[PDB]
Amino acid sequence: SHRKYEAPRHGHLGFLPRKRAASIRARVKAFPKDDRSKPVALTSFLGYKAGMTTIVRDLDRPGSKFHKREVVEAVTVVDTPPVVVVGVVGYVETPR
Amino acid sequence: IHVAQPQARDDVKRTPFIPESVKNLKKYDPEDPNRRKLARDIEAENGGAGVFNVNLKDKYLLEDDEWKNDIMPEILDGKNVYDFLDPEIAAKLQALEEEEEKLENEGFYNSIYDGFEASEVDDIKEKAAWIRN
Amino acid sequence: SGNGAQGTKFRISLGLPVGAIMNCADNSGARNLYIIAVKGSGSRLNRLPAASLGDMVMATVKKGKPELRKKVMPAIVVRQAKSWRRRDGVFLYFEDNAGVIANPKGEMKGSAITGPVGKECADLWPRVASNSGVVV
Amino acid sequence: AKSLRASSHLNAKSVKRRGVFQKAVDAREQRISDKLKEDLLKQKLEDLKKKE
Amino acid sequence: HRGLRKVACIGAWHPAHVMWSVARAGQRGYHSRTSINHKIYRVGKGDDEANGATSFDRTKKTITPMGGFVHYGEIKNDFIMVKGCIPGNRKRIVTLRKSLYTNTSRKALEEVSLKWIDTASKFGKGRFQTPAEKHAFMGTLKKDL
Amino acid sequence: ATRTQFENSNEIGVFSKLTNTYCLVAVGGSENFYSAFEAELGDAIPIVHTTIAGTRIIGRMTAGNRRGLLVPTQTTDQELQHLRNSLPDSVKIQRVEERLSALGNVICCNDYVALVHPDIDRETEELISDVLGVEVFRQTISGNILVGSYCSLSNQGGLVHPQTSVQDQEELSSLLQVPLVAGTVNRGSSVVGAGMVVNDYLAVTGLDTTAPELSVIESIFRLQD
Amino acid sequence: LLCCNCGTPIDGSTGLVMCYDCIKLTVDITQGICRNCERFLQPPGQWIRALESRELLAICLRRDASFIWTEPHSRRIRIKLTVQNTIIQQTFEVEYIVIAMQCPDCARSYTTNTWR
Amino acid sequence: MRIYQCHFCSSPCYPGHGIMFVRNDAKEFRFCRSKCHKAFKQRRNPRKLKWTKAFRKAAGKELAVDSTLTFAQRRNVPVRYNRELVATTLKAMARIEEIR
Amino acid sequence: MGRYSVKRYKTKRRTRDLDLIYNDLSTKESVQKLLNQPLDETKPGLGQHYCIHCAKYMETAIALKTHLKGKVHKRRVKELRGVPYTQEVSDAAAGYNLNKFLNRVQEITQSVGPEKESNEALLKEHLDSTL
RNA sequence: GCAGUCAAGCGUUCAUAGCGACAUUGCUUUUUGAUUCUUCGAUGUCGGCUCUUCCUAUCAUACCGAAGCAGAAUUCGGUAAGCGUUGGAUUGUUCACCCACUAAUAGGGAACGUGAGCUGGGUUUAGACCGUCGUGAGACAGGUUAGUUUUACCCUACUGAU
């Protein structure tokens, strides 16, 4: 018995198990590596998502068929007040 | 192989028009040490064909090259600027600024019951307010 | 795109699936068309292949001159009436569905086209823009 | 069409990392880091106000 | 019979178990997600009045819409505008990582220029941008005089 | 005469407009098509990248001659201000409102004479005579309705579409005061207006226009000295 | 009216296009179209017995007419056939590759229940 | 960007709002929002509906004939862009809006 | 939305409308067009018996007699009397193209008005002696 | 059914680029048989719908080798199952058959996948008509119509939650 009509799978097996997360703040699993020739640069930032709005933009994209033409699209607005440092943590590399 | 004719209709006729700048123009030569470059050669000298960006501006005539790259407002609170701009705006606006001055003096902008005074014209409205409640 | 259609076609909402009778706009002699397939379409289980404003479809003639009747021939949609999205911010829709018929290169059979032609189809097909009395 | 993990594109993409697209990133991380030392200046001037 | 919003066949006689991939019912939403390559458009300041004013519009207006956002107050702080749709909902906390690698495509290198920002009311069908507009279009009312 | 093909389409009058004092070309992709007009014209007459209603098909939407350029209703104020900047003050530009948008299929014209579609309204029919400075005659080519795609004119001479009867040619040439030959362009395509562009000293056709049809086109417009 | 790629003047009316022999080459008109029994099959159910006039028609039904001489041992049948505004007659060839599947009638002798 | 008014509402239609409708006569019907749009499909009359601006200029409400309103017509003759014209019209629009 | 406004007022089932009908009544040539239309197989009265006001085909000549003595037709006559409400009125109310508006109202009051009211006085007299 | 090996005729010359007759050695259980093993104090005994996974004997996509491979378009073969494989007319049908798109419309298994998941069209009780056979009751896996689809709250498995 060979299914008679092949069809793609429903849903992605990479995002399993589907479950409620441990917090309303998702932790970050991975960072950009380390570039030790640059100034001291803070990587990520944290703010609060607040609604959406619409934006028209003059699409300056050479090669496209909307070059030098107007394109409307939707953006998000995230409230981003300043953020204050309170701690420093060092990590030792182990064979674990 | 039929060919047609003007067929002698009217006395008014054109000679065909060629601008003198085309007759003054040199003929273009493909393999040429000294020549005008092209739109191709400016395109391929920095990035490929599809990825090079061409300014549509800096190709058009104006009074001053300082404002060849300025940006029109195109929208304000008042509806849209391409409808408001004109020749002689301020000449037409002084005909509007004169329409204030004839109305200001004549009392077009300006800020009482018979037989009933301040204690009596108030209290009839005060007694009627109790009756509606 | 496909044969004869210059460039790329931007995505618009799919208005006509298979089995949809639409009016015939040009003066070839047909009155309506009958979509039986859509060229340049996908393949997924139980989907009906859907057309849109300006795709080449295979279409038959149900009403019209008996010479064009009972044989399959390619057709090009020019009016949709299912509202799509222009990339400047307004959705629009036409009164009724319409299609003109063409050879597989992309050349017209009639000379005149009545009614307004969709702008998104007039960019993609040059010959439809040649016979377009009204654009947009 | 080739896969996203094909070798002919990843040898083609990595040259574009060496050229145009790294230097615009290097132009970006300098202009960001200019404002970061200016953030230490404006916040110590408010500390100079409270010393008054 | 017994429902139509479900999966009919769930397995076979061998293996005599329900497999780990057969789309059962359960929790939906409130998962953690990561979506990459979102392009920053506008970075403005809180003290900077006329944030919504582009180089075109020149109307002194802040990106806070009329009567604020829905289920969220006023933006009177610094903000970030980024295109598309950030995963999550309103008044929730997002973290903003930076790009993890040098991005190669031409789209991730272009300079944007905003031509107009909408500030109409999101609580309903907004037709006016500022209350100065609505008072101009409606004209006077009974409650004013 | 010059063979030039837009990206892979041999239709040129769809994509480009050619008058005596200016020349308009679309903005699609890369500057291979714009450079081919630089080889013949140079800095003599202005050549303009432009869009009409956010489209590439600018040759069938506009219709004009060496005095005026008429643009349809859907032309934005940015596209209209762009044409006025790139063209000098000798050229007039006016946005025209009509029931029918495509002016190129509806107006065929040279410096003093224009033919029109019959159903055009007379509020435009005076406006054509004022802007272009031309006369207007309400006429159908060979019982076909679109006068722009099925004919082509210059001050030199004219070219029509090959279903035209010889009885129709001598009458219609009396209106235009120029010679007319029924012919084809781009290997037997009937649409002679959209295939080629022509002014008094230059003609650009497709790469699929045969050498016998170059002998027809270069003779009727008399490109040689 | 010069015919395309000839140079010859033709009639200005509704006629064909291009010289009638400048078009005669350029158009194409066709463009589309048991191991133990030795009994060739009719596709619904039948197994008609059998290179020429009788079986030559049945191979045209699935695909003048003539069969070329190709090979007896290899499993090929090739056939020439002529198709017969413009009227035009052109011929072409079709290779019909032979496959062998067992006659259910003449499979019955191997299962010992022959008579019924 | 061309902040055109609703065909039924006479209210401004910002880019990214409403629906357009195109008839076989090929004029455009640009709609403020869905309330005006669904009231057009039903064939109603804005001279009769009290809440629209086409009623208020008709029945003796808000002023219609005034010289401040004739300045914002439409232009098909493009003025070739001097700067100091544009600087006047940005002061002109804010002046008429006070007088209106 | 509901059950009723969807059934009658989709885009499949649209009438012509008050705009295009007013152009047909404004001149004598187009009135004499639409009475004498060529007969077709698909049109309901075989391409005759067409009411211009209510753009609607009737089967029989008797079916025009019952239509004109009716409050459906007497609605539409009371509809098309004044200015026909193009897009130009909706912009004129905002303060946009008044001189475009005030000149057309000048046209329809003095010029097109008594011509349009002359075509209606002939149609009610021409559809009377034929019935 | 598929694969080896011997190579007859052919591919104008030339067995082995490509086709292929039969000798000879095998594999497979997706075939019909052979057996009647387990089930006769019921293992619910066709097809379709829905759905996951697996096999490679690969139709398409990736990278290669060969020629009777100019280009273009194909033909033959190698590692390869990561990822795809349809919309329809007629039949209860698997099977078959044509129309049309597409990159391509490859072949199979999992109790001939899957009925406390469906459906009941077919088959397979009682009613009934027709044809042949029988003196007669009745027979016909010949044709045609009408014919009840039962429970999960239990443990495990699974998807979620403490």
mmCIF file of C-alpha atoms in Angstrom, chain D residues 9-10 12-18 20-22, chain E residues 37 101-109:
data_model
loop_
_atom_site.group_PDB
_atom_site.id
_atom_site.type_symbol
_atom_site.label_atom_id
_atom_site.label_comp_id
_atom_site.label_asym_id
_atom_site.label_seq_id
_atom_site.Cartn_x
_atom_site.Cartn_y
_atom_site.Cartn_z
ATOM 1 C CA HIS D 9 27.002 29.584 -4.346
ATOM 2 C CA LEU D 10 28.836 29.437 -1.007
ATOM 3 C CA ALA D 12 30.439 32.762 -4.711
ATOM 4 C CA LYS D 13 28.870 34.372 -1.637
ATOM 5 C CA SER D 14 32.009 34.281 0.500
ATOM 6 C CA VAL D 15 33.878 36.484 -1.972
ATOM 7 C CA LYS D 16 31.149 39.108 -1.520
ATOM 8 C CA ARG D 17 31.782 38.865 2.217
ATOM 9 C CA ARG D 18 35.430 39.760 1.642
ATOM 10 C CA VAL D 20 31.749 45.272 -0.440
ATOM 11 C CA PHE D 21 29.631 43.966 2.403
ATOM 12 C CA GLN D 22 32.202 43.722 5.194
ATOM 13 C CA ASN E 37 16.698 39.613 8.764
ATOM 14 C CA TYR E 101 26.810 37.349 10.238
ATOM 15 C CA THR E 102 27.610 39.721 7.409
ATOM 16 C CA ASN E 103 24.524 39.789 5.209
ATOM 17 C CA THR E 104 25.185 39.359 1.525
ATOM 18 C CA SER E 105 22.092 40.348 -0.457
ATOM 19 C CA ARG E 106 21.646 43.744 -2.081
ATOM 20 C CA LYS E 107 18.445 44.321 -0.114
ATOM 21 C CA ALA E 108 20.315 44.408 3.207
ATOM 22 C CA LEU E 109 22.605 47.209 2.126
#
